[PDB]
């Protein structure tokens, strides 16, 4: 009986592969051939934020494109002012092993996380003026690797127990569980309409989830190692991934298959982050060799570099209006480029 | 605008008040020593943790030695894959690796050796030093001194091994027990001494779960680690 199920699964995989092969008729490189190259991009460090005692693990931009939050090994959450560089808050965490941070779209909350199997919620708009912890959401059986907001009362969190979850903060309970991954879920990304999200999970496969029902609509494979970062395209019909085999890939939801690969022989490090620009023409990746690269999303060429860090680049971020990009690093400094 | 000036002044005041507390926190962060505790179910790391103390993802222990502060982080309630959350411990002074020497054949000793080799050769832990505890010495001695359990069955090289010159047997111990102990220690040292780098070393001890000198050994090994780091920095070592 079990062998029959295995053979049927193999046949279904063959059927899906045949369908995908049938659908393909031309390459994205062929389609976007006559388009003129972007040329060359030379951004420059406009700011440099200091105040963290150790290596930075995460940062998330605010919806107003002015404030941002960051998390560090020293166990501190800091809210900056990008324009002036004056700190606005410094929240002390109960644990120093934090892997992710997020800011609410309203701007009244931030979310911590990490190896203690929890992401907490902190209220920035207390009348007393003190940033206290509001909710503490428990229930994951492995470390937390992402904790992202949908609104002021919904958060979607990734975990190192192979499952994602949706929480309603008011009562502090789960509402759905997203099972089906075999490895460790390592990243997250909400759709622009916030009706679907993607995730790569350390088994070299990304998935497509329906938030309302809680099921895996699509599965994307093609990477050779662990997937570290994942971003959505501006229009919501594609996404990009970053893995440990030193390459990035572009996938299309409707076509159901890969479109392009962003790799080079000289690159043998792992991608830690990926992000798209405002119009989606540029794909920016931060590597383990202390540098970030600027890729032409439609042409696959290399256009620039962000070489201003002296240790691992662990995080990336573009503003909600394309004004600038931030990058944290293991050398404890946040840098802003333009 | 006067309102803009007032807002900017208040912003600068808040920034200064935050910088002051960060400066106060930097000293406490710099004058504290963080240690990662590894091991296995077989190894008596639980008893060692109890002696040091005398769905949480990590457990934390704090002990003080001569006005020095140590933070020992014990991983608990995590899946069995390690290649991801082992990178969170790049900046710890030492790793306390507890391995039960009285557990040779499943080949628990071989599994422990493989884990040690992987941790030693990892890329984000290439400047961390290991304080290796070889536990269950009494059980090892009792097993070897009387029984048909033969190490050469599972470690064939044990046949052509004799106690090293620098051995310091405990007065009142069998040559066979001493030979077995030092063979296991040499097996663990063969991996670490082969690096030939100079940025990290191993510190082996022969321990029992109820030993009262483990905290002193950790203290002395941390002192040696820091002294060696400085000596290497100043071009002496």
């Amino acid at each position, epitope marked *: 009986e079990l062998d029959q199920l295995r053979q049927e699964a193999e046949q279904l995989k063959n059927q899906i592969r045949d369908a995908r092969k049938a659908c393909a008729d031309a390459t994205l490189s062929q389609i976007t051939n006559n388009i003129d190259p972007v040329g060359r991009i030379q951004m420059r460090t406009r700011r440099t934020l200091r105040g963290h005692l150790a290596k930075i693990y995460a940062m998330h931009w605010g919806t107003d494109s002015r404030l941002l939050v960051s998390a560090s090994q020293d166990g501190k959450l800091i809210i900056w002012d990008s324009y002036t560089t004056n700190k606005v808050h410094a929240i002390p965490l109960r644990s120093s092993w934090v892997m992710t941070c997020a800011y609410a779209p309203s701007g009244n909350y931030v979310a911590c996380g990490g190896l203690d199997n929890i992401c907490s919620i902190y209220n920035l708009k207390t009348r007393e003026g003190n940033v206290r912890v509001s909710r503490e959401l428990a229930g994951h059986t492995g470390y937390l690797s992402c904790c992202r907001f949908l609104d002021d009362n919904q958060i979607v969190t990734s975990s190192g127990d192979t499952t994602c979850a949706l929480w309603d903060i008011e009562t502090g309970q789960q509402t759905t569980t997203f099972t089906g991954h075999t490895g460790d879920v390592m990243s997250l990304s909400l759709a622009p309409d916030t009706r679907l999200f993607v995730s790569g999970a350390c088994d070299a496969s990304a998935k497509l989830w329906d938030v309302r029902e809680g099921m895996c609509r699509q599965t994307f494979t093609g990477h050779e190692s662990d997937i570290n970062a994942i971003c959505f395209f501006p229009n919501g019909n594609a996404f990009a991934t970053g893995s440990d085999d030193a390459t990035c890939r572009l996938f299309d939801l409707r076509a159901d298959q890969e479109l392009m690969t962003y790799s080079h022989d000289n690159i*043998i490090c*792992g991608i830690t982050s990926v992000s798209f620009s405002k119009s989606g023409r540029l794909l920016l990746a931060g590597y383990d060799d202390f540098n970030c690269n600027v890729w032409d999303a439609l042409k696959a060429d290399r256009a620039g570099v962000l070489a201003g860090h002296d240790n691992r680049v662990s995080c990336l971020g573009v503003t909600d209006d394309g004004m600038a990009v931030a990058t944290g690093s293991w050398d404890s400094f946040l840098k802003i480029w333009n | 605008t006067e309102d803009q000036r007032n807002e900017e002044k208040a912003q600068r005041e808040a920034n200064k008040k935050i910088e002051k507390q960060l400066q106060k926190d930097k000293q406490v962060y710099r004058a504290t020593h963080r240690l990662l505790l590894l091991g296995a179910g077989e190894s008596g790391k639980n008893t060692i943790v109890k002696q040091m103390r005398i769905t949480s993802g990590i457990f934390e222990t704090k002990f003080q030695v001569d006005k020095v502060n140590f933070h020992m982080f014990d991983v608990g309630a995590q899946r069995d894959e*390690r290649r991801k959350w082992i990178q969170c411990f790049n900046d710890v002074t030492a790793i306390i690796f507890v391995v039960a020497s009285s557990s040779y*054949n499943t080949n628990r000793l071989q599994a422990a050796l*493989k884990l040690f080799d992987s941790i030693w050769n990892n890329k984000w832990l290439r400047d961390t030093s290991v304080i290796l505890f070889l536990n269950k010495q009494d059980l090892l001695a009792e097993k070897v001194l009387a029984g048909k359990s033969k190490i050469e069955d599972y470690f064939p090289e044990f046949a052509r091994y004799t106690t090293p010159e620098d051995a310091t047997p405990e007065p009142g111990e069998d040559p066979r027990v001493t030979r077995a102990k030092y063979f296991i220690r040499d097996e663990f040292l063969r991996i670490s001494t082969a690096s030939g780098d100079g940025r990290h070393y191993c510190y082996p001890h022969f321990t029992c779960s109820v030993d009262t000198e483990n905290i002193r050994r950790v203290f002395n090994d941390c002192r040696d680690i820091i002294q060696r780091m400085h000596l290497r920095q100043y071009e002496l070592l």
Partner: nanobody
Amino acid sequence: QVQLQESGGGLVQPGGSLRLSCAASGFTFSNYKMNWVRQAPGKGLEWVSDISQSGASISYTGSVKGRFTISRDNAKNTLYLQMNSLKPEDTAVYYCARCPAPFTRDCFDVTSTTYAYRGQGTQVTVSS
């Protein structure tokens, strides 16, 4: 997608010889360090041997030294484990786990929670 398929098992009289093989696809074979593991009934998984990318850093477990030999051919993406003079204690399932990442000298690939880059297995039995 990463694929590892092992074949060449069966039942062999004690003192005989065998040869397992494994074919890999979906990744560059020459950039990863291969590996063999096994799981006897009633026991957990145990590491057997491994080999480097170029094929010059072989190493075996204690209880198989001299008998087993591991060789990899990067021109055909295949791994082999020549077993000689088997014993009744070598009855188990043999897998072909792989390095988690390329170009590294590390490995965490014996985990009970199914390692993603591990094969399905091949049955080897030794009886009189």
